[PDB]
Design a binder for these strands. Structure first.
Ligand SMILES: [Mg+2]
Length: 390
DNA sequence: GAGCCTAGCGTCCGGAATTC
DNA sequence: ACGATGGAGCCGCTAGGCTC
DNA sequence: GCATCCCTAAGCTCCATCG
DNA sequence: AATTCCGGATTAGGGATGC
């Protein structure tokens, strides 16, 4: 968490709407989402836990945008005693941390119900995100604020929001940082050194406004030049650097903390079909969702998963079967079909007599045609029949 | 933060401020 | 017959107030 | 009978009642 | 300097009132 680093990286950031993330895989810092949900203050009298709710609806929206996800489960930080409130040990602090971990466990449970993979990070989640990105396992890393670039990530997405107007993420690519700003990974690390990180809150003595001028000065290397100083215009910025030298270079250990990679993968990242029964059970006992409501909310994820599998070329009997195409529709400028489906196993209906009429979705024409070309074919046949009739 | 539920709009064109 | 003017319902989008 | 002045709507799509 | 707005302008109807 460098002070003012995002401001430094602002000229490179690009406003990217969420729909434009289709076909991309993103690692998600689950902890940041859970804390963000904890920050909600509106529902004072009825503060139902929005950690699970926001997680689910974000997952649903991104899934409908053809965005696959893998969630990173935070581990233990490597480094942390003033015998005050400042020390993390305290009943309210400890028990609160236990509650946070419990919420994380529940979120993991819902991820398993949805069939979405989650990995285990050794330490900070950001490190595992950058590990997935650098390893080609994901296309981007989603974080409101973090040192993901310092852990070696190439692409970072920021400021996620689902506002009806302007759903977007601010994108930061490493290549455009090295080209437009001329900042390599080591340059970012050293910038985090003089400006301070989540480990070091101090931005002083270096003002930081002239550190960019130092980066303009030297083009070859960054950290090595901080190294020769231990053996030790230019004299003046080096004088402020001397004000940093009286500190004694305690941040070297932080450097090697950023550069060392401890994260590993135990199992291949895999996606499974959402479990309708397990999802009804979980949402019922954890969020007090009626079974019919949980089914109604999960239907779009079931249809999306099955359509994806059929497009991949694998078809099984357990997949959902469309009864018919009702009519063509348009959703946010996208051409879609209104699909009436057949009632799947363990699906709960609100209306006893008409629930089977109620089973309905709206799917993108492209993906639905890839999944059920026969259904699309008979619909287009009926359209040829109406145009031929008149 | 996101969803749910309700309401109401729905023309063309050009100067305008400064890219939802 | 005919088809034409209705007209009521619906559709897609946006906004506001309240709920989970 | 026709003119004047002001206000308001302005999407699409079936069916249906009417000349 | 360029691409979103919104304020004014269109066109057509309807109603109340005036010649
Ligand atoms: Mg973390």
């Amino acid at each position: 968490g460098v002070n003012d680093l995002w401001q430094i990286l602002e000229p490179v950031k690009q406003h990217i709407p969420l729909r434009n993330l289709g076909g991309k895989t993103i690692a998600v810092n689950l902890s940041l989402w859970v804390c963000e949900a904890q920050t909600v203050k509106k529902m004072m009298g009825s503060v139902m836990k929005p950690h699970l709710r926001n997680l689910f609806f974000r997952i649903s929206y991104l899934t409908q945008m053809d965005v696959k996800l893998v969630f990173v489960m935070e581990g233990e930080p490597p480094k942390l005693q003033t015998r005050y409130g400042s020390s993390g040990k305290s009943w309210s602090q400890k028990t609160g941390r236990s509650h946070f971990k419990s919420v994380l466990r529940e979120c993991l449970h819902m991820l398993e119900c949805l069939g979405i993979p989650w990995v285990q990070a050794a330490g900070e989640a950001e490190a595992m995100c950058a590990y997935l990105n650098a390893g080609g396992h994901v296309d981007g890393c989603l974080t409101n604020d973090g040192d993901t670039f310092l852990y070696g990530a190439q692409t970072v997405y920021r400021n996620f929001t689902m506002n009806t107007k302007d759903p977007h993420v601010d994108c930061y690519t490493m290549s455009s940082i090295k080209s437009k700003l001329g900042l390599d990974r080591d340059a970012l690390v050293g910038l985090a050194i003089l400006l301070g990180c989540d480990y070091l809150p101090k931005g002083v003595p270096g003002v930081g406004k002239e550190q960019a001028l130092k980066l303009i000065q030297i083009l070859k290397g960054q950290s090595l030049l901080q190294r020769f100083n231990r053996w030790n215009n230019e004299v003046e910025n080096n004088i402020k650097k001397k004000a940093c030298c009286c500190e004694g270079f305690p941040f070297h250990e932080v450097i090697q903390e950023f550069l060392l990679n401890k994260d590993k993968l135990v199992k291949v990242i895999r996606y499974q079909r959402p479990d309708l029964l397990l999802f009804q059970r979980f949402t019922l006992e954890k969020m007090e969702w009626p079974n019919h409501y949980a089914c109604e909310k999960l239907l779009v994820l079931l249809t999306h998963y099955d359509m994806i599998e059929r497009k991949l070329g694998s078809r099984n009997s357990n997949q959902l079967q469309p009864i018919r195409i009702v009519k063509t529709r348009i959703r946010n400028g996208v051409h879609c079909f209104e699909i009436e489906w057949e009632k799947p196993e363990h699906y709960a209906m609100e209306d006893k007599q008409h629930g089977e009429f109620a089973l309905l979705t709206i799917e993108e024409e492209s993906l639905f045609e890839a999944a059920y070309p026969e259904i699309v074919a008979v619909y287009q046949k009926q359209k040829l029949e109406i145009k031929g009739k008149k």
